[PDB]
DNA sequence: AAGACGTGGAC
DNA sequence: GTCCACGTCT
């Protein structure tokens with residue numbers, strides 16, 4: 001019944017489509033950036049980041065040529081920072097290998113870092129009209145209600161089932177519009193809770209509504225880590241930071257020196273981490289910071305720093321007015337904030 | 345397969 | 356407290 005379905009979905013879309021910033025044009029670069037930013041991140045949160053990011057890096061080439069530190073800083077606070085290291089890498093490769101043109105072949109484009117099945121579909125259909133599915137969580141939710149698919153939406157193969165369904169119902173005339181429309185329906189009408197089935201423009205075609213189970217779809221099925229953080233300052237008030245490893249948690253961001261302590265043993269694991277002279281005073285605060293897959297229980301220890309050799313390794317001696325120029329995870333921004341108000 | 349990988353806001 | 360939030364790499 002796809003031909004009817006298309007027109008009713010596309011009609012609704014033409015009326016209800018939000019004028020979001022990345023919807024101003026179909027520049028493949030602007031689309032790509034916005035899709036990367038929208039991964040596991042709400043639209044309202046993304047809007048200001050996208051505007052500043054495009055301000056700072058207006059073209060794919062501008063992004064490619066920026067220092068990675070300048071690119072992390074722009075992403076500071078968005079979460080899932082490797083999304084941006086991959087985008088930065090993929091863009092550099094588009095500039096050098098594809099002459100600054102986002103490739104329109106699905107196979108070539110998917111080879112770029114951070115680009116998976118969803119982003120292939122999203123970017124190529126909207127920028128170039130390539131008829132590839134663009135199944136995200138919204139689409140998965142819509143399709144699961146529309147076709148009463150009770151497969152655990154977390155299973156790897158489940159998406160592949162949804163992608164097949166898109167290939168056979170999609171408006172091959174206008175794939176971008178169609179894909180866009182399906183996503184917008186998930187966002188505006190067919191929502192995680194209390195979907196507005198009474199208002200929905202494809203309600204006639206929907207098995208979950210007919211069966212009375214829209215609400216129960218889709219079907220879908222964390223460790224605590226103590227952290228001791230050191231805030232060490234000069235008599236000149238310069239502060240000691242360090243750049244995290246290029247791999248693992250919060251890759252490449254800056255932080256106040258810290259280590260995992262396993263419980264509340266002491267402030268010695270901290271002081272020991274030498275390699276220059278430090279003595280630490282009583283801790284001033286403890287608060288916790290949540291990630292998707294773990295929770296840091298931080299305890300910050302103010303302390304005095306004395307110089308006994310060069311600062312190297314990933315460590316850097318930062319004057320206070322310059323902290324603002326580095327990218328810190330939110331947890332460490334709070335470390336600085338609590339330390340500063342304590343200093344009152 | 346299924347875990348690593350940030351964050352904020354509705355409820 | 357839970358869910359959003361399959362997105363992608365591993």
Ligand code: SF4
Nearest residue numbers: 190197200203206214
């Ligand atoms: S009818 Fe209700 S459930 Fe079916 S698609 Fe429209 S909103 Fe989703």
Ligand code: NA
Nearest residue numbers: 110111112115
């Ligand atoms: Na890829």
